[PDB]
Amino acid sequence: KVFGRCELAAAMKRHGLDNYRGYSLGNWVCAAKFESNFNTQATNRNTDGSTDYGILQINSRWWCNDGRTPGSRNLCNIPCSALLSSDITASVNCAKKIVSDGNGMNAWVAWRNRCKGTDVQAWIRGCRL
Ligand code: NA
Ligand SMILES: [Os+3]
């Protein structure tokens, strides 16, 4: 599923990401834009042999099991395929554990490089939320 920008803002808000660990909704929408282009099916291989999965590009090194990432953890206790559903529930629940782990949203390289320090609330402007 390729979400609309405001469609994703509404789904992320419904799941309680707005101001989760102090991160306003625009931070999460900006992260999803630059991680996955709002595409729940997005998959991208990392240099270390792990892969990033779904709308928020959650990594198999720590968070999910994809059956091909040796010596990795599965701290969200899920198959990585669960992160590719049109339903973002599993991605959001796992993202709440990630952002609570001490790194905040620095866990997402695209957020650090393309959202952090910017007018992130632009990503929710025009939306009925
Ligand atoms: Na893993
Ligand atoms: Os708000």
UniProtKB/Swiss-Prot annotation:
Residues 1-129 form the C-type lysozyme domain. The keyword Disulfide bond applies. GO terms for molecular function: beta-N-acetylglucosaminidase activity; identical protein binding; lysozyme activity. Transmembrane segments: none annotated. Keywords: Allergen, Antimicrobial, Bacteriolytic enzyme, Disulfide bond, Glycosidase, Hydrolase, Secreted, Signal. In the egg white and polymorphonuclear leukocytes. Substrate binds at D101. It catalyses: Hydrolysis of (1->4)-beta-linkages between N-acetylmuramic acid and N-acetyl-D-glucosamine residues in a peptidoglycan and between N-acetyl-D-glucosamine residues in chitodextrins. Disulfide bonds join C6-C127, C30-C115, C64-C80, C76-C94. GO terms for biological process: cell wall macromolecule catabolic process; defense response to bacterium; defense response to Gram-negative bacterium; defense response to Gram-positive bacterium; killing of cells of another organism. GO terms for cellular component: cytoplasm; endoplasmic reticulum; extracellular space. It is found in: Secreted. SMART domains: LYZ1 (SM00263). Lysozymes have primarily a bacteriolytic function; those in tissues and body fluids are associated with the monocyte-macrophage system and enhance the activity of immunoagents. Has bacteriolytic activity against M.luteus. PANTHER family: LYSOZYME C. Lysozyme C is capable of both hydrolysis and transglycosylation; it also shows a slight esterase activity. It acts rapidly on both peptide-substituted and unsubstituted peptidoglycan, and slowly on chitin oligosaccharides. Monomer. Belongs to the glycosyl hydrolase 22 family. This is Lysozyme C. The gene is LYZ.
